[PDB]
Design an enzyme around this catalytic site. Structure first.
Site, PDB file in Angstrom:
ATOM      1  CG  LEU A 137     -22.378 -65.744  -3.439  1.00  0.00           C
ATOM      2  CD1 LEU A 137     -22.428 -67.218  -3.335  1.00  0.00           C
ATOM      3  CD2 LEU A 137     -23.035 -64.984  -4.201  1.00  0.00           C
ATOM      4  CG  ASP A 138     -24.733 -60.347   0.722  1.00  0.00           C
ATOM      5  OD1 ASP A 138     -23.308 -60.200   0.919  1.00  0.00           O
ATOM      6  OD2 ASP A 138     -25.439 -60.057   0.103  1.00  0.00           O
TER       7      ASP A 138
END
Ligand SMILES: CCCCCCCCCCC(CCCCCCCCCC)(CO[C@H]1O[C@@H](CO)[C@H](O[C@@H]2O[C@@H](CO)[C@H](O)[C@@H](O)[C@@H]2O)[C@@H](O)[C@@H]1O)CO[C@H]1O[C@@H](CO)[C@H](O[C@@H]2O[C@@H](CO)[C@H](O)[C@@H](O)[C@@H]2O)[C@@H](O)[C@H]1O
Ligand SMILES: CCCCCCCCCCCCCCCCCC(=O)OC[C@H](COP(=O)(O)OCCN)OC(=O)CCCCCCCCCCCCCCCCC
Lengths: 82, 106, 48, 50, 85, 90
Positions: free
Chosen positions: E41-42
Site C-alpha cells: 500500500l501507498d
C-alpha cells in the site's frame, strides 16, 4: 447548559407575565376570570394593548415564536419520552 | 514546503482524511459518495508529482483554503464520541472511600 | 474521656456499628424547639 | 481545543496546573456556545437580511 | 445486547481487507502483516484503509493515532481498547 | 538589665483538636487567579474603558432614570377605566 438555555428563555417571558399580572390586578382589581371577562369590554384599547403585549411576550417565550425560539431544539439533550 | 518526508506525509494524510470526511457528512446516496471519493482520490493522485518546494507550497495552501471553503455545519459524529449525543450519559463514578472532616461526628 | 471516645470513633463501645447514636443537641431541639415551633403555627392559624 | 488530547479534566479540557486567563469565565467550558462557522459580522448581515 | 470479541474484530478486518482491491494478495494477510510493506500500500492507500476501518466499526479516530496503526495487530489491539462498537 | 521576669514559664500556643486530612488539592493557578480577582481594587487604574463605564453607569444612567421618574410623576391613574376617558392627568 441546555437546561440553562431553556429555563432562562422561559423566565424572560415569566417576567412579562408578572408585569402583565401587576397590570391586571390594578386595572381590574381581580385575578379571577369571572370578573375580568365580565368587565373587559369597558376598559379602552390603550390599556388592553399594555396588558396583552405583556401576556403575549409571555406566550411568545414558552410557545416558542421567533423572538426567542432556540430552547426547543436545544432541549433534545433530554431523552425521547421527555 | 519540503519534498518526500514524514513532515509532508503527515500533513497530506491529515488533509486527505479531512477531504474524505468533509464529503462524508456532505451528501447522502453512497453511490454518489464513492464516485466523488474516487475523483477526490484522482485529484490527489494527479498533482502528486511536484518537484520544487515553491509550487508545492502554492498548491498546498491553495488546497488548504479549498478544503476550508467546503466546511459543514455539523460533522457526522458517532454518538459515544465527543460531538455526539451519547457522550457522557452515565459516567461511572470513581470508587472512593469517605474522606472525613470532623473529629466529632460524622 | 470525650477525646478517648471520639478519637476512637474516628479511627475505628468502639468496635460495633449501630444507628443512630443519639447526639448532644437532639434532646432540646426535638422536645423544646420543635413543639414550641409547632405551637407557634397552631396559634398563628387560630389567631387568624 | 480538541477533545482527543487526554487532559486531566476531560469535562472542561484543562490540564491540572494550567494558567487561567485574564477574564477566564468567558473562555470556560461553562461559558457561552461561541459558534465557529460564520463570522459574527457576516452572521449579523444574514439574519437582518432574512 | 451485543458484545464483540477479539476474533470478531479479526474476521471483520480480514474480510475488510479482502474486499479492498489495491492489496497484493488475498492469501498473505495475517494479524502481523504490515499494511505498508507486506500488503503493498501507498502513503495514501493506508489512509483510505483507516477510513474504512473507522467507518465500519462505528468509532472515529483523530490523526494522533491514525499513523500509529501501521500493522494489522496494532489496529486490532487499538479497536479492542475502545468500548464503542 | 531590663528583662521580663524569671517567673513566667511561658509556652507555645496550640489551637487544639484534630488534624483533618486534606480533602482538596489546591491548584496554584486557580488560587493566584482568585487572589488576583478579589483584591482587584488595589491595582485598578483609570483608562478610557474604565472612564467610559464610570461615565455611563454612575452619571448617565441615574440621570436617565431621573428624567423618567421625575417627569412621569403623577401622570397615570389606571384604577377603573372606560373608553374615551383620559388615561393620564397632564
Ligand atoms: C474626558 C475624556 C478626555 C480623554 C482622557 C483619557 C484619560 C483620562 C480618563 C479619566 C476619566 C475619569 C473617569 C471619571 C468620570 C467621572 C464622570 C485616560 O487615558 C487613558 O487612555 C487609555 C487608552 O488610550 C490608556 O490605556 C492604555 O494605553 C496604553 C498606555 O497608555 C497601554 O499600552 C494600553 O495597554 C492601554 O490600552 C490609559 O493608560 C490612559 O490612562 C487621559 O488621557 C491621557 O492622560 C495622560 C496623563 O497620564 C497621558 O499622559 C501620558 O501617560 C503615560 C502612560 O502611563 C505616558 O507614559 C506618558 O508619556 C504620559 O504621562 C496620556 O497618554 C493620555 O493617556
Ligand atoms: C421586542 C420584542 C421583545 C421580545 C424578545 C426579543 C428577543 C429577546 C431575546 C433575548 C432574551 C432571551 C432571554 C435572555 C436570557 C438568555 C439566557 C441564555 O440564553 O442562556 C444560555 C446560555 C447557555 O446557552 P448555550 O451555551 O447557547 O447552550 C448551547 C447548548 N448546546 O447560558 C448562559 O450562560 C448565559 C448567562 C448570561 C445570560 C444572559 C445575560 C444577559 C441577559 C440580557 C438581559 C438584558 C437586561 C438588561 C436590563 C436593562 C434594563 C434597562
Amino acid at each position: 447548559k441546555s437546561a440553562l438555555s431553556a429555563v432562562l428563555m422561559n423566565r424572560f417571558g415569566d417576567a412579562f407575565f408578572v408585569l402583565g399580572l401587576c397590570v391586571i390586578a390594578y386595572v381590574f382589581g381581580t385575578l379571577n376570570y369571572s370578573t375580568i371577562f365580565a368587565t373587559a369590554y369597558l376598559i379602552n384599547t390603550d390599556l388592553l394593548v399594555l396588558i396583552m403585549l405583556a401576556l403575549f411576550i409571555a406566550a411568545m417565550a414558552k410557545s416558542a415564536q421567533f423572538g426567542l425560539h432556540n430552547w426547543l431544539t436545544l432541549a433534545m439533550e433530554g431523552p425521547t419520552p421527555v | 514546503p519540503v519534498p518526500f518526508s514524514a513532515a509532508n506525509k503527515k500533513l497530506v494524510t491529515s488533509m486527505y482524511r479531512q477531504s474524505l470526511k468533509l464529503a462524508r457528512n456532505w451528501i447522502s446516496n453512497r453511490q454518489l459518495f464513492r464516485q466523488k471519493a474516487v475523483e477526490i482520490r484522482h485529484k490527489f493522485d494527479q498533482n502528486a508529482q511536484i518537484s520544487n518546494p515553491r509550487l508545492l507550497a502554492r498548491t498546498l495552501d491553495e488546497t488548504r483554503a479549498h478544503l476550508y471553503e467546503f466546511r459543514h455545519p455539523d460533522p457526522i459524529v458517532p454518538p459515544s464520541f465527543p460531538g455526539g449525543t451519547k457522550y457522557e450519559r452515565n459516567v461511572p463514578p470513581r470508587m472512593e472511600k469517605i474522606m472525613q472532616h470532623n473529629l466529632y461526628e460524622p | 474521656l470525650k477525646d478517648y471516645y471520639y478519637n476512637g470513633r474516628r479511627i475505628l463501645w468502639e468496635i460495633k456499628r449501630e444507628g443512630a447514636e443519639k447526639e448532644d443537641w437532639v434532646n432540646q431541639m426535638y422536645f423544646l424547639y420543635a413543639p414550641s415551633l409547632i405551637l407557634l403555627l397552631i396559634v398563628m392559624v387560630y389567631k387568624s | 481545543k480538541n477533545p482527543y488530547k487526554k487532559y486531566d479534566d476531560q469535562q472542561d479540557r484543562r490540564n491540572l496546573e494550567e494558567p487561567l486567563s485574564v477574564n477566564d469565565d468567558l473562555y470556560d467550558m461553562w461559558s457561552p456556545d461561541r459558534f465557529t462557522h460564520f463570522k459574527n459580522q457576516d452572521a449579523l448581515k444574514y439574519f437582518i437580511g432574512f | 445486547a451485543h458484545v464483540l470479541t477479539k476474533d470478531m474484530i479479526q474476521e471483520r478486518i480480514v474480510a475488510l481487507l479482502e474486499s479492498f482491491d489495491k492489496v497484493n494478495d488475498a492469501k498473505n494477510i495475517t494479524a502481523t502483516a504490515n499494511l505498508t510493506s507486506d500488503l503493498g500500500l501507498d502513503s495514501l492507500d493506508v489512509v483510505e484503509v483507516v477510513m474504512a476501518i473507522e467507518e465500519e466499526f462505528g468509532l472515529e479516530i483523530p490523526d494522533h493515532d491514525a499513523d500509529e496503526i501501521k500493522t494489522v495487530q496494532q489496529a486490532i489491539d487499538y479497536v479492542s481498547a475502545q468500548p464503542a462498537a | 538589665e531590663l528583662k521580663p521576669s524569671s517567673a513566667i514559664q511561658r509556652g507555645p500556643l496550640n489551637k487544639g483538636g484534630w488534624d483533618a486530612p486534606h480533602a482538596l488539592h489546591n491548584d496554584g493557578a486557580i488560587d493566584r487567579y482568585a487572589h488576583w480577582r478579589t483584591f482587584y481594587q488595589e491595582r485598578f487604574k483609570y483608562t478610557r474603558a474604565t472612564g467610559k463605564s464610570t461615565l455611563i453607569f454612575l452619571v448617565a444612567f441615574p440621570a436617565l432614570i431621573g428624567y423618567v421618574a421625575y417627569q412621569s410623576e403623577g401622570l397615570f391613574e389606571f384604577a377603573g377605566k372606560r373608553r374615551g376617558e383620559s388615561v393620564t392627568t397632564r
